[PDB]
Amino acid sequence: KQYLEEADRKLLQIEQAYEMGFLTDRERYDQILQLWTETTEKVTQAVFKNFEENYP
Amino acid sequence: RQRDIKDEVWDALEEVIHGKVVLLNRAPTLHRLGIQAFQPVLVEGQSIQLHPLVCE
Amino acid sequence: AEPGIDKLFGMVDSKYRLTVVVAKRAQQLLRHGFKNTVLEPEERPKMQTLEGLFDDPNAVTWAMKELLTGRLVFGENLVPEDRLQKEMERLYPV
Amino acid sequence: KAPVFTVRTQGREYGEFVLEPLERGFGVTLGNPLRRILLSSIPGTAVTSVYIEDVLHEFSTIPGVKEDVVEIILNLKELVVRFLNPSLQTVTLLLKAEGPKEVKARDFLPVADVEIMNPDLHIATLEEGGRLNMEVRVDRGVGYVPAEKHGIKDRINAIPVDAVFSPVRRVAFQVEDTRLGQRTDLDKLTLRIWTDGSVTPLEALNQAVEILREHLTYFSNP
Amino acid sequence: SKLKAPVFTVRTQGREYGEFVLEPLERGFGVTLGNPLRRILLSSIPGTAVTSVYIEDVLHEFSTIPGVKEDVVEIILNLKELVVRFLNPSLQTVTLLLKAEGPKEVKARDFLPVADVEIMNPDLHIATLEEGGRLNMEVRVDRGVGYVPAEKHGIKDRINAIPVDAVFSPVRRVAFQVEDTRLGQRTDLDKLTLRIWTDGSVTPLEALNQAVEILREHLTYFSNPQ
Amino acid sequence: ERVVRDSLAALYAEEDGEVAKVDGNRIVVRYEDGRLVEYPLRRFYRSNQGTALDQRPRVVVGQRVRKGDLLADGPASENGFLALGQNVLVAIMPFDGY
Amino acid sequence: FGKRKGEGFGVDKREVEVLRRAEKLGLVTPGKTPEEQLKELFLQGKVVLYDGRTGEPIEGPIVVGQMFIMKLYHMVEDKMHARSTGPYSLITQQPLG
Amino acid sequence: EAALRDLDEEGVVRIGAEVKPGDILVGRTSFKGESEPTPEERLLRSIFGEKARDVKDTSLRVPPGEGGIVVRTVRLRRGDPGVELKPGVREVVRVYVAQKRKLQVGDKLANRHGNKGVVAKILPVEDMPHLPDGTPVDVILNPLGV
Amino acid sequence: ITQVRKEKKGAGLEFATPEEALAAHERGEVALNAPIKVAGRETSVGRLKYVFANPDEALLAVAHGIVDLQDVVTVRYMGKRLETSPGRILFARIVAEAVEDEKVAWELIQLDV
């Protein structure tokens, strides 16, 4: 839930930086995919840390 | 005739196959371990029994 | 695993030559009815029937055991083929 | 029909027992109870308590002796003692030696109707001026009782020892399919028993079977 | 310090159910005794089962009878639930006769009574008959052990007889409880309770005794070494 | 339920009515119209793949049925529901490599 | 469960052992009654299970339930086949298929 | 007569008979293709004094691994009402054989989620894992499949 | 069977005397396998409490439910005093008996993992 709530505010910042014309449609799309890639990675590590520490 | 088959022929067959091996093959035969030799153990039932270690 | 397979591979320069020696010896045993064997009565491979212990019918099992004893000599050009065939039939008829 | 029972023994410490053929399922039906009994109920002897003169507790070290106290206690767990008198429920063994000597089991002061099966068992090596004065308590019992569970003290400074009573060290059993004529589902039971030599593997089995039969008589009187 | 023969309690409801308590027992003997008896009770207890059926004007199992709602496959499936108690121990086989007609629902009651033979579930439904429906059959019930499929025994009293899968075992369910107990000096003792369900042809107590005897007789086999 | 009905394996009542006759081989229904309709049942017929298509009567003599009420179960249906199998008690656990 | 408690049986010794390993697994909350812990496992769809060979429990609580399972059309009776010698083909003289 | 026991007067196996591999379903004879018996057969026939029959046994038999109970037979001859066969065919016989199939080792099971497997072992009820109240489970599925 | 328990109750406390630790564990203040420091070394309660003369003793204790196979414990095997689980001892024994060479078996296994 934490990583998702964080990811949504990050996504909002990329939308504000789009509508202001700082990044293109291309650049915005690329940044969104990157955010979700890293957010995915983060939750993977979280699944396995919780398993290792609390349910080995 | 299957009803004419008595119990001594099963014992005779055990003698026949003694020490002999058969080849088992599974398609696709991708490499040479697609065929391997096994000493058969006669079983009731219509299924061939395969050893776990050779499944890979 | 075949009993003493690692030692059997020790004896040959090529694993395939072991197969040739084993196969040929087993053919000799079958042709001459096992009476040319180099095994001793207690070394004979045995098979458990309903009756009890009987001789293992399998000539390939026999041949490998014989090989392990050391009593078999194998190689190339040891003896003319006809001479070998005739000497074996003189010693052990069919 | 009636299964044939087959015995293969090595000395007094090992035996394999094969019962075949049995009706389907009976291999594990017999094997499991016997194994449970053979581990838990077989009467044997163990070291339950030890006093070493200047040693206060289990983790102390003895001056002049190579082994620590823990190691000596361990060696004592390995001592195999056989009570010849049926009524003897316990014994105290004494050992005092010093100087340059490797103390074995035989060194224990002989006690009447108490046989030490493994007299060559090492206990401790003593250096110059090293001194070993100790009393060991040997009780009759069954199974395995940890030191903290029996809590036996003849005196203060007496150290309680995990009590390994069982003459049976290991039991392994394997059931495998076998055929009599047309029936292939029959069972073949192979039972493997390791003892310490005080009770023989064949003896232990017979004792185990007896206990179970007796327990079957308990279904008699409501 | 050695434990001594335990009190053996018996709680029975009718011929169907029983509870069998043994306490106190040395630690771990609850399953040491309980489990082999459960295994023996589920397998080796002799019993009775329908082994064959001949229905008149029916050549094989895949037939259908005019006037009857159930096909022969379902009829034989209903006969597999028939519980038949033999009062005489010397009696190993019985052929039950049934003749029924008209708008009736044939139950197990309708079997023609045979001496020294009691049907434990006479309400078991067998076939629904309609005006003109005629069911006349002969079912062979035998005594045996375990599960013998029709293919193994192949029992036919006559030519058109249909062999039936025989579930011989009278035991429906076996559970056993192991609870904590003490002799008040010593703890971690075992209290063993055998719960035994039966079809009623044999009694849970009778079942338990046969189970004990089988295990006892089996311990005998360890007598002559080699 | 819908799968069995569209499959045409199961048999249903045309209109409201009362069941006159019930057999392994046939079911006779008396409708509102007064007309007596007889439904023969397909019993142990061999399909293209050799599985047995057979219909079993699910109603009894004298039963009041409505329009669309089940008369016979087709193959692989239980009281009009698609039955492709059995409901079994399963344990999820390894067992000795079997 | 409630049925059992009325029938005059308490928690089994082996049920306690399984409960021990289960609280080591973080499945049940420590300090609760044996009944409460069994209910916690049951809400996870796991039950105590006895090995019919031994009588001893499976060392952990196991998922058990009703599953819908079908027998498919591929059956060994149809597929099992063997040949010593038999029919050969017209031109090739090789065995038929 | 052991071989012909279950055949009716006309040579068709009777309804309700159990047929196993090798058993005759429909008996049939075919005229032997003209051939000169080998000198071995000349001598054999001469030794036993039995005329070589004009016809050979072409009967339809149960194939390996098949069989069951005979539930139906259809026989169609030529020259009987309502039936006309393809040219040259005197008569056609169909035998419908039924079998009740119990689940066995090698049969394939599956659930609706894609779990599929073949039955490798059928255990007696006493080996099956069971609930405290005595109920054995039906199927044991390996968690490694999930 | 070769995985070892890790418990949170002890949580790395220091203890001067091992009998203090066993007493603290007996009070239920510290778990058997919780990582702990007694004297200067960091050991676990189970390593002090259960010290087994040979493998057969460790496994007999498992049979009687004194310890599980995953509990870390002190076992004397082939002359050295080891900190492992009975399970890891059992694995080493499985290998050893299979190949009928006990020394080589000990060389091959990675026991601590």
Ligand SMILES: [Mg+2]
């Ligand atoms: Mg200790």
